[PDB]
């Protein structure tokens, strides 16, 4: 029927003076644009069809052509920035926003989807969608007593589009738009659908990827406990964004980090730091590194939860990127920790894996490790035990690696190496 039309037949139907012929041709275009492989988006654009589709969005009297054109334009907008731009340049934004209030749920949903692609292109189209007034009607679609009465796919599409209104930086979304969206986001974060939860967590992770004021906007809404709970979820698509959001939050102030600790987050890190998914391990170790950069009482919470042995484990064996994050966590720990906490660190076995990582080619991890060693030696000086630590390093082959690093081409590297040798190995 409307299957496998040529673009020229589509054009001929759309240019007819017959609304029903236009509808059939538009459905044919929709079917071309929704096929598995290589939708002919550029051919459709070049045929000049976008303004026709946009005009069809306004035909309240023929809801089927509204739907077909909305779907066609959705899929054009799903392509490259230039293809999305063609949709925007056709005037689609206000027309889709007008369709959000449609009495036909499938049409409103299609408009939600299209606005999600447009806003998802980037900060500029995101903010232009916002300026056209999309947030109010989008949120009105979610103003129901119980989200469970909404169709599952409908709610997932709304959540994803809102997450695109929260996404991207340079600039980040307008502060007032974030404040407007956040309560609905908090509500979606307690919904029981795994995809809604995943995308709500992604939105929160975007909103916390910024300066402390943005983090504070999120933390003030009281979502950290729910984020920790979701951090313990079994579905990896939920754990990943929840953990990203938590890590972002602990890049903030020590009080914000403390809200992560108070919510129980550390109790999850034995599993996270041994998680079989490499990216979970990496992100959890980065999170830890930004917790050990905090206050001594927070370092002490890391100690109490038994997480130093897990950091020793990741330093001993993990993907190299995770090992680099672990080195960072250790240097932060040693820079901020009390003497007793650093002693504890040594008693957990940090020295040998720390030394074994000095044979790595990455310059920055070498610097990080040498810093950590210096800090530990400083604690040993305060205890008068530099000799015992020197013996430790010598027995595991670390002295050979440092003395070798004296010949390292990097400046700060061979400087710190020389200082360690002449100061503690003479």
């Amino acid at each position: 029927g409307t299957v496998n039309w040529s673009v020229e037949d589509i054009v001929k139907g759309i240019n007819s003076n017959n609304l029903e012929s236009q509808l059939q041709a538009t459905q044919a275009a929709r079917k071309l644009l929704s096929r598995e492989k290589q939708p002919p988006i550029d051919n459709i654009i070049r045929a000049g069809l976008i303004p026709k589709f946009v005009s069809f969005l306004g035909k309240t009297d023929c809801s089927p052509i509204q739907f077909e054109s909305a779907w066609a334009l959705t899929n054009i907008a799903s392509g490259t920035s230039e293809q999305t731009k063609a949709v925007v340049d056709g005037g689609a934004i206000p027309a889709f926003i007008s369709l959000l209030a449609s009495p036909h749920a499938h049409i409103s949903e299609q408009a939600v989807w299209a606005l999600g692609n447009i806003a998802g292109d980037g900060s500029a189209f995101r903010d232009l969608v916002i300026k056209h007034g999309a947030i109010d009607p989008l949120l009105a679609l979610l103003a129901v007593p119980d989200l469970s009465t909404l169709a599952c796919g409908y709610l997932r599409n709304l959540t994803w589009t809102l997450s695109n209104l929260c996404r991207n930086k340079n600039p980040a979304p307008p502060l007032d738009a974030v404040e407007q969206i956040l309560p609905t986001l908090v509500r979606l974060l307690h919904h029981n659908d795994p995809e809604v939860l995943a995308d709500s967590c992604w939105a929160i992770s975007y909103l916390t990827d910024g300066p402390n004021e943005r983090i504070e906007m999120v933390v003030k809404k009281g979502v950290v406990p729910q984020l920790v709970k979701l951090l313990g979820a079994t579905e990896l698509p939920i754990v990943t964004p929840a953990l990203r959001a938590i890590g972002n939050i602990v890049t903030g102030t020590d009080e914000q980090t403390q809200k992560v600790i108070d919510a129980g987050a550390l109790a999850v890190f034995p599993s996270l730091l041994t998680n079989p998914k490499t990216n979970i391990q990496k992100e959890a170790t980065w999170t830890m590194s930004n917790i050990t950069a905090g206050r001594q009482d927070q370092i002490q919470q890391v100690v109490n939860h038994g997480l130093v042995p897990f950091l020793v484990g990741v330093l001993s064996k993990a993907d190299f990127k995770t090992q680099k994050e672990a080195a960072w966590a250790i240097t932060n720990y040693t820079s901020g920790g009390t003497v007793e906490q650093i002693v504890y660190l040594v008693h957990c076995g940090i020295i040998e894996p720390l030394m074994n990582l000095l044979s790595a080619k990455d310059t920055k991890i070498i610097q990080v490790i040498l810093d950590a060693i210096s800090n530990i030696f400083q604690a040993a000086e305060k205890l008068g035990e530099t000799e015992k630590l020197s013996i430790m390093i010598e027995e595991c082959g670390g002295l050979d690696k440092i003395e070798a690093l004296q010949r390292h081409e990097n400046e700060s590297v061979y400087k710190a190496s020389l200082n360690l040798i002449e100061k503690y190995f003479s």
Binding site: S34, P39, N75, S78, G79, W113, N117, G120
Partner: peptide, 8 residues
Amino acid sequence: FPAKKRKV
């Protein structure tokens, strides 16, 4: 992951 989705 990509921000856009095509309806298939």
